């Protein structure tokens, strides 16, 4: 199948921070999931990855040097990006995947969200 993703069309950073909320087409709750934020039209850089597994506290992280924070919420995940640089102004795309229970589930490429860091 294909999960749905609804995200804000734009987000103006306040104090070089913003809140990236991703609205999904999925679950009341409890499965093993890997949420992802990617920056760029060529979606190169993966800004953040909030991992979940039923219970076990949400494990957010970044391999790219972003001060990322993640908050769960049923059919949504919110990426709290801090210390964003003005040169990081770009289109960010949300991604969601379930790895258990099977089968593998993925999202249909969203319309994205332009983050304008002033």
């Amino acid at each position: 199948n294909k999960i749905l993703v609804k995200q804000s069309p734009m987000l103006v950073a306040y104090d070089n921070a913003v809140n990236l909320s991703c609205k999904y087409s999925y679950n009341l709750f409890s499965r093993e999931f890997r949420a992802s934020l990617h920056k760029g039209l060529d979606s190169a850089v993966e800004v953040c990855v909030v991992y979940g597994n039923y219970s076990q506290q949400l494990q957010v992280y970044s391999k790219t040097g972003f001060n990322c924070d993640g908050k769960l919420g049923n059919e949504s995940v919110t990426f709290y990006l801090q210390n964003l640089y003005v040169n990081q102004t770009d289109i960010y795309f949300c991604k969601i995947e379930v790895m258990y229970p099977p089968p593998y589930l993925d999202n249909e490429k969203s319309n994205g969200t332009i983050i304008h860091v002033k």
Epitope: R34, Y51, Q59, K63, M99, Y100, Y104
Partner: antibody, heavy 119, light 108 residues
Framework: VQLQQSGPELVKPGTSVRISCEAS????????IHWVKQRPGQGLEWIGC????????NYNEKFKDKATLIVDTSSNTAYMQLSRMTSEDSAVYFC?????????????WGAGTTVTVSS | DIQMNQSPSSLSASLGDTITITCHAS??????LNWYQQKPGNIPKLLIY???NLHTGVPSRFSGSGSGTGFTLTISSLQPEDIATYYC?????????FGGGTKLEIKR
Amino acid sequence: VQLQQSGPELVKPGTSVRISCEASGYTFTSYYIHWVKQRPGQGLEWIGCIYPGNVNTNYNEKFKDKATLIVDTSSNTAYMQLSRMTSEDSAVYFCTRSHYGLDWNFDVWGAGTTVTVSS
Amino acid sequence: DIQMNQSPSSLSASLGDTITITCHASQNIYVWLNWYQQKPGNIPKLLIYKASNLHTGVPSRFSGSGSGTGFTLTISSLQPEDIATYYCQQGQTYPYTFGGGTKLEIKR
């Protein structure tokens, strides 16, 4: 959580052998399977990885042609194909995994498969 | 890709000695670099992941620190059982890359 690897194999210079590595003791589709080669006396280098589930794969440009990563979700087996071999292919190939969500490192290694490419 | 430059290519120390190894990275890997131990003819085992995070079961005599470009592994109170070769690997960017390894000899 064991990682069983194939026995040593002798390969005649030119041919292609496909070693294996079957997981057991955890959820196969919740981890990447990485392959790394260690030449005798030398350090070890990352060949490529594969993620059973969406069958996505990643290769190191130093092994683009030879290395072909295949997966077997039924027998929890991860295969590694080394095509067109030479005395530069002779080394011990290791099997290991990485957590899919928290992809930070390789904590479970196979015991390896020594490969000789002598005629 | 990224280059791994381990420092002591080899090193001999006595029982109880608190040695130290170094691994410099060509560019910024942040805190994504792990350390491994591989005894003679044996399989390599994870010692330290994420710069300072020890792996379950690794004694506390093993320590690790660093960020960005500089990284270091410290083993205090050496034991014969620590005779092995130590590799540094980065887990930030594909392709993953390990170091040259460092050999250790417990002097008796």
